[PDB]
Design a protein around this ligand. Structure first.
Ligand SMILES: [Zn+2]
Ligand SMILES: [Zn+2]
Lengths: 53, 39, 31
């Protein structure tokens, strides 16, 4: 099992029927604004927008 | 289809980070606006 | 460093959203 990369980007059209896990996360305000100096170690998520296939 | 609208639907099964269908669409337009001007 | 994203091997997108980099972030802020 893996975290659903669609849910991690922010929207998974399959909802509860997804085979992947839908891990609820909290977005990093600074990354949402455009830049966060904490990187990988940020306590909050940095969601990518690239679509998985 | 929009099965996340249907009554009794848990929006959070579909949307992460506290997004809804309206805030998700705005965030998609923000991605597009900011990215177009970058290298 | 003061600036861990510059370090060899670091992924810029762990720090910068929207495909920003140090140069284009500075310019965007200082507009
Ligand atoms: Zn999913
Ligand atoms: Zn952060």
């Amino acid at each position: 099992i893996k975290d659903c990369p669609w849910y991690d980007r922010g929207f998974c059209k399959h909802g509860p029927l997804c085979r992947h896990r839908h891990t609820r996360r909290v977005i990093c305000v600074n990354y949402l604004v455009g830049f966060c100096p904490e990187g990988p170690s940020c306590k909050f998520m940095h969601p990518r927008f690239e679509l998985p296939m | 289809d929009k099965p996340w609208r249907k009554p009794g639907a848990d929006l959070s099964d579909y949307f992460n980070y506290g997004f809804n269908e309206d805030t998700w669409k705005a965030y998609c337009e923000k991605q597009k606006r900011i990215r177009m001007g970058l290298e």
